[PDB]
């Protein structure tokens, strides 16, 4: 590359970080303003401009423009101030941007695969320029978090997600590929407007869609190898669950909604058992719902109990999921699926028909809001649990705040501060009237998915087992220091997520080599140095050709 | 070109206007959303988005983003709604954008030539990709209209100007080259901030700057030929005037501030003499100032009088410029330069020291606000002139409105509507209490410079004489219809400027061939068809390779 | 790629195999003659042209021109008729071409690394376009086979060699890299002429040369990985031997002169023991020389004896190398190096000072001409051995024919046809007066090095052990059929070398996985299908973009 295409390419574009000698040798002289700036000046300038803006959507437009222009400076900006720019880059600002502005990308991002393109997906994959990609994020747009069906406009969900992949873990930006598979949109408003950008049919739910998914995965693994990591982001619950079950064995697929959330919740529980004297195996758990997400969380919990030596049956006896119809129990009138069969225990005497009565009779030590039907955790049940348990553990995993089962402020104020609270939604620190301000921990998947993805990429793992996420949860819990536990935090601070992700990767990497699930050989003697070398560094590299004189 | 670089190039980028067969043959399949859109849908979408925005600066950012992304659609948007988007694209929104946001261009535009690059300007010119350029706009940034010195941030002034070159005249976008020559900035604020993007020295006024201008013009004419049209935009008054005088003979240079404004004012005067019974040669003129701009206007006026057969001396006797010190008169104590010597007439008896008394004694038929010292046209002098003349002609050429000598509303209301008013600043229609709403004509250079530039480009003219602008003014006046003259308008509507510009070009082209100043041979038999063929059309052209089967 | 660069690139160039639709879609229409030809017509045409030529050097020029023009057709031509074109492409015609015509390549081939470029070898390696290379052949030019020192003109030796890598094994042409390291030339004639193309200094033998080799290997392994296969071709005996010893452990290096020749000779010996009733371990061996080449051959022989269960000491007792001074024996006046110490046996009673007397007393069953001092195998010693042994085994590994120790015709005629003869030099079939025409087997490294290289490339082997070549020799011997052994052939025919090489690779691959020396995981269940899939196929692949119509 030379001349103008050097700046036009975001991978190699330096803005004004092009030194004078670089400008003169590479033919960039005269096409740039006379000033020469280090990357620090560039980042400071864009941080000032970002501080000027006041709305998260405007910040999103600005930061994505920076990404389309210069990627290395964009990632330095993102890594430099990551706690404040993470909501802008991934969630929930991406949903709002996709809904209101639709498609904003002034540059080709990822691939658009349609059901009209069935039978020829391999050519579409061949059209993608990058020869080696390691991570692929696939979206259907059917279930955008909090916005329902956006159709083809959900392509911002993978791209933003991939930014985190590079901002936290260190995966190279050119090894990532965001893919949007659109089979139509289900909402009327998108079907009606003339400026919708995609198929105008209603969403296709026939065998054609399943065959399209099969063909796409086969084509991507044919071009990029069997060990390419493919992640299904924001599919429908039915589609995502079924596709994870179908492709988990064949391909290197892990789903963040099902598996990452279980890892984050289990990490919170391990932090709680580090704070509370009693262990996890001693105390029983009550779930708000019983679905494959809830079954995944309970499976991680029972695995964590088993690894400590306690028997699988005794560990399963602890969890008592509660369905929509009622408490999950043997002989119940309501149907019981095979997956939720293991947590089907003996009948309680009352057989309560309400959740509050269920807490009253069962007297659980931990409560988990996995059902997400809405604002289910009433103050009455919270007070009942606080009476039952000395230090109750309350989890409200659903987001946003309105959809959450409980509010951190109410949960902390209603009790005397004894409860341990962790929620998916972000909440500000809560200060009681007497004092003792409490900061509710926030558990989001950004803790887990980047580090696990980096470890799987580096280890050339072909099958992502369910125990990998247990190891990741243990690593995430071990990240916490003693003083953080004393403060009452259950998760490491998001201000220094990058190192956390790196550490997580290390642990997973060691596990992947201990259990013969990693196919990158020779096995490194030290995993930490190997992963720290493999990571991407967002620092400009000189393009000056080496000039010397022969003797 | 094939694949991704086809979209990355704004010249060849089509957005979703890429037909399905084009996407499949050229390898764009899968990189675009599934929808295929004609250019009309694209323009409608962007017009709706533009209507959503409410501030002219936001509109400027949006439209320039469109230009950086897809140029043909940008020019269709600009030509489609040109009256409302012309203030956004060129003036005064470009000044505000350059002042507040500095440099916003996410793509290389034009060239940046600095005084530190002296001695090597030819290499900088060689760095520019386009092999053939016909028009060059050079800015120094010293005098941005209404904003003083912006230093290197004035580069938005050429680029926006060049948009008009393509939006009105039809000059090809790739034949244009915006050049910013920065020799430092004079204002302290730009020198002080760390994020200024250019030289941190104070503006250089020595022989080095003149030699840099000489070298730049020599280098540009060496690479692109002697007939390359070079225009000095927004230099300092001293620098622009001196450089026009120096390079007018050697190179194909015309300055819009000096020569285009004279053409527009003379066109307004010709429209006035079409409205008013009396001819131009019969009535005398009084100027608010006497400078090379005022001398250029008066020179155009005397040329127009001469071409009608009236002697040069008699024509010169009519104009009576008024200096800052006082009325320009022979034997005056104040200095008289050689250029303003011809309009130095016999002493009036009063020798008035104030402008109002000057109007009272001289009793001019026409008044022209070329001095622009500020709000000089008092209501008293306006009433005095309206008493003197049955239908006074009042010109307030200075802009913005605050800097204008008079307000169109006040000028029309104060008189009974008899006056003919034309101003550089845009004014809304003025409706009197009794009735008879009057729309003051607005005279801006966008009438003249695009068509003249197109004619000069097509005719391969090496020297732009001063009579070319007289011919252009006559053409612009002839554009007006009888009903428009009856309404009181002095200029053609800006809604249909494009055709106006085309017509202007035709006339100039004919003149350039009648006076042996055009070097494009063979001379076309009909100039209209020649120019209408040569113009650029902002319509997508199919990239499909021709596929046929041999017999 | 599109248009003219598609033909200019030999990798993607098809000549007239471009179908009409390919020409029309890819923009090649009109740049090619109207005819459309399959690859068969192209190969037939070039075979006819090749038959017209009469001198091997002219054939070499023609075939290398074809390679520079279209590589896939060149490799189809080479594979189609490989027995006759192998002498043209690699040996000995490459030496003659390099000597007489110097550098003939009209296209950049490989890299030229000079000692003046020391300290900056990494930049030179970075200049090479191909991102992934698997095989590297490095030449110094000091010892070209039969032509001494050619300096920088020896670059034809790697390139031609790499052709075999693709013609026999199936290694992709773009994964190969020929490198010529020139530290000067030692011969006066090249130093004297003005048109020599390289350094005009005498060959550098100081520490600078060793440091240059170290730096080059480090730079190549840094860019292309630790498992890149690097082969030292035609270095000096001292330099090649020392560099193999030094870099065998660190890098994936195998030397054909030392290790491949041992494998070929051992394969001949195994074919002999399949023809002769007695086993290898039963009969003793006498060598003409004792050097690291002879020690390598004897090491392969003792390994082959050991793998059959016979003890290492007993196996070593069999080989009796004969030095230049005299028979290698304990207590000898002449110096004995550490490497040749194991084959230092008890003193014979005569202690013969001549080779004929050595054969007379020792009465060896096998004789091997590894010394290559010249025409050493006198008819007297041949008759003596034929009297000693019922079916003597005579090996003349040195080439060319004049340098050979014996002539196949003389060896076969002098005995009654009982002897088994294998020589490096090619010899025509020898027909005795009574009858029974005998075809002497020819043992050249082209049997071994391509298949071993392919197996090492596919298995990602980091260290090439000495037992790999023993396994390769066993595979090569097992290639022979029973009827071929009955005919008296010791090596498979060269007409079908490709499949032979493939089979060799398979065996080596299995060995590399059986001994945990292969780092490509997951380990394939069947090695044969894996290697047969991985090989390069010299068949044109359609460049037509997939064109379909959406429903
Ligand atoms: N200027 C460049 O862009 C540049 C320079 C050097 C190397 N590379 C890349 O290094 C690769 C060589 O692989 P290796 O020797 O490191 O294998 P490795 O053994 O070190 O790693 C094993 C796997 O992990 C992948 N991987 C390693 N680091 C990664 C990262 N930061 N992000 C995402 N994936 C990562 C690798 O692609 C590889 O497949 C080349 O394919 C090449 O693409 C690129
Ligand atoms: N990306 C994330 O942050 C993430 C991840 C996992 C789960 N979740 C949460 O899980 C929920 C959806 O996941 P899912 O797999 O469980 O859905 P699902 O369709 O598989 O099943 C929902 C379960 O909730 C139970 N339930 C529903 N309403 C109930 C009610 N009013 N009272 C008692 N039980 C009720 C149902 O019995 C059912 O078993 C959402 O709230 C979602 O916020 C979020
Ligand atoms: N796909 C394309 O981009 C394309 C196709 C055809 C021709 N062209 C251009 O046409 C030019 C051939 O010149 P010609 O035969 O028309 O000479 P001409 O006699 O018709 O015109 C005389 C001069 O006017 C210039 N000119 C003509 N039209 C112009 C326009 N719309 N905008 C700006 N300048 C214009 C020309 O460059 C020429 O120098 C080529 O240099 C080539 O750059 C471009
Ligand atoms: N781009 C445009 O629209 C354009 C073009 C031409 C001229 N102008 C107007 O011309 C003016 C500057 O051009 P210029 O070449 O004449 O400047 P200049 O420096 O060459 O001379 C200014 C003239 O104005 C006279 N003058 C100044 N103040 C006066 C006062 N209070 N009373 C009477 N006379 C006074 C002076 O005698 C002097 O001759 C600006 O108002 C500018 O708006 C604008
Ligand atoms: N159109 C093309 O040029 C094209 C198409 C597909 C794949 N490829 C190549 O396939 C490679 C993917 O490697 P893989 O999935 O086959 O790994 P693999 O597990 O099948 O093989 C292991 C190693 O052997 C190498 N190798 C395989 N076949 C080879 C051959 N015929 N010649 C020389 N070396 C060979 C590979 O580079 C790899 O490093 C890509 O790097 C890419 O360069 C090229
Ligand atoms: N590329 C090939 O085909 C290939 C491969 C290996 C060996 N060779 C042959 O080996 C020879 C060189 O290899 P090297 O490593 O053995 O050289 P070397 O320098 O390492 O040693 C040569 C050996 O030959 C012995 N010798 C020399 N002259 C002798 C004589 N007149 N009588 C008895 N013994 C004598 C010497 O004692 C010495 O040990 C060449 O003939 C060469 O053709 C060829
Ligand atoms: O490399 C650099 O630092 C660099 C920075 C800028 C400033 C800029 C960029 C994007 C924007 O959206 C806005 C804005 O709109 O304020 C401003 C321009 C050119 C550059 O080369
Ligand atoms: O070609 C097209 O029509 C096309 C249009 C869009 C929409 C768009 C572009 C720029 C914007 O700034 C905004 C916004 O910010 O609202 C939106 C995106 C991709 C396309 O390919
Ligand atoms: O692709 C093809 O078949 C093809 C073949 C030829 C013939 C040819 C090539 C090389 C030569 O050296 C000689 C000669 O010298 O006789 C002749 C020319 C153009 C082609 O496109």
Curated annotation (Swiss-Prot), chains A, B, C:
<feature type="modified residue" description="N6-acetyllysine">
    <location>
        <position position="218"/>
    </location>
</feature>
<dbReference type="InterPro" id="IPR046346">
    <property type="entry name" value="Aminoacid_DH-like_N_sf"/>
</dbReference>
<dbReference type="InterPro" id="IPR001891">
    <property type="entry name" value="Malic_OxRdtase"/>
</dbReference>
<feature type="binding site">
    <location>
        <position position="292"/>
    </location>
    <ligand>
        <name>NAD(+)</name>
    </ligand>
</feature>
<feature type="active site" description="Proton donor">
    <location>
        <position position="90"/>
    </location>
</feature>
<feature type="binding site">
    <location>
        <position position="237"/>
    </location>
    <ligand>
        <name>NAD(+)</name>
    </ligand>
</feature>
<dbReference type="GO" id="GO:0009055">
    <property type="term" value="F:electron transfer activity"/>
</dbReference>
<keyword id="KW-0479">Metal-binding</keyword>
<feature type="modified residue" description="N6-acetyllysine">
    <location>
        <position position="202"/>
    </location>
</feature>
<dbReference type="Pfam" id="PF03949">
    <property type="entry name" value="Malic_M"/>
</dbReference>
<feature type="binding site">
    <location>
        <position position="143"/>
    </location>
    <ligand>
        <name>(S)-malate</name>
    </ligand>
</feature>
<comment type="similarity">
    <text>Belongs to the malic enzymes family.</text>
</comment>
<dbReference type="GO" id="GO:0046872">
    <property type="term" value="F:metal ion binding"/>
</dbReference>
<dbReference type="GO" id="GO:0004470">
    <property type="term" value="F:malic enzyme activity"/>
</dbReference>
<keyword id="KW-0021">Allosteric enzyme</keyword>
<dbReference type="InterPro" id="IPR037062">
    <property type="entry name" value="Malic_N_dom_sf"/>
</dbReference>
<dbReference type="GO" id="GO:0043231">
    <property type="term" value="C:intracellular membrane-bounded organelle"/>
</dbReference>
<feature type="binding site">
    <location>
        <position position="257"/>
    </location>
    <ligand>
        <name>a divalent metal cation</name>
    </ligand>
</feature>
<feature type="modified residue" description="N6-acetyllysine">
    <location>
        <position position="134"/>
    </location>
</feature>
<feature type="binding site">
    <location>
        <position position="233"/>
    </location>
    <ligand>
        <name>a divalent metal cation</name>
    </ligand>
</feature>
<feature type="binding site">
    <location>
        <position position="45"/>
    </location>
    <ligand>
        <name>fumarate</name>
    </ligand>
</feature>
<dbReference type="GO" id="GO:0004471">
    <property type="term" value="F:malate dehydrogenase (decarboxylating) (NAD+) activity"/>
</dbReference>
<protein>
    <recommendedName>
        <fullName>NAD-dependent malic enzyme, mitochondrial</fullName>
        <ecNumber>1.1.1.38</ecNumber>
    </recommendedName>
</protein>
<dbReference type="Pfam" id="PF00390">
    <property type="entry name" value="malic"/>
</dbReference>
<comment type="subunit">
    <text>Homotetramer.</text>
</comment>
<comment type="function">
    <text>NAD-dependent mitochondrial malic enzyme that catalyzes the oxidative decarboxylation of malate to pyruvate.</text>
</comment>
<dbReference type="InterPro" id="IPR012301">
    <property type="entry name" value="Malic_N_dom"/>
</dbReference>
<dbReference type="GO" id="GO:0006108">
    <property type="term" value="P:malate metabolic process"/>
</dbReference>
<keyword id="KW-0496">Mitochondrion</keyword>
<feature type="modified residue" description="N6-acetyllysine">
    <location>
        <position position="324"/>
    </location>
</feature>
<feature type="modified residue" description="N6-acetyllysine">
    <location>
        <position position="250"/>
    </location>
</feature>
<feature type="binding site">
    <location>
        <position position="399"/>
    </location>
    <ligand>
        <name>(S)-malate</name>
    </ligand>
</feature>
<dbReference type="GO" id="GO:1902031">
    <property type="term" value="P:regulation of NADP metabolic process"/>
</dbReference>
<dbReference type="GO" id="GO:0008948">
    <property type="term" value="F:oxaloacetate decarboxylase activity"/>
</dbReference>
<feature type="binding site">
    <location>
        <position position="444"/>
    </location>
    <ligand>
        <name>(S)-malate</name>
    </ligand>
</feature>
<keyword id="KW-0560">Oxidoreductase</keyword>
<feature type="binding site">
    <location>
        <position position="143"/>
    </location>
    <ligand>
        <name>NAD(+)</name>
    </ligand>
</feature>
<feature type="binding site">
    <location>
        <position position="290"/>
    </location>
    <ligand>
        <name>NAD(+)</name>
    </ligand>
</feature>
<keyword id="KW-0809">Transit peptide</keyword>
<dbReference type="InterPro" id="IPR036291">
    <property type="entry name" value="NAD(P)-bd_dom_sf"/>
</dbReference>
<dbReference type="GO" id="GO:0005739">
    <property type="term" value="C:mitochondrion"/>
</dbReference>
<dbReference type="GO" id="GO:0004473">
    <property type="term" value="F:malate dehydrogenase (decarboxylating) (NADP+) activity"/>
</dbReference>
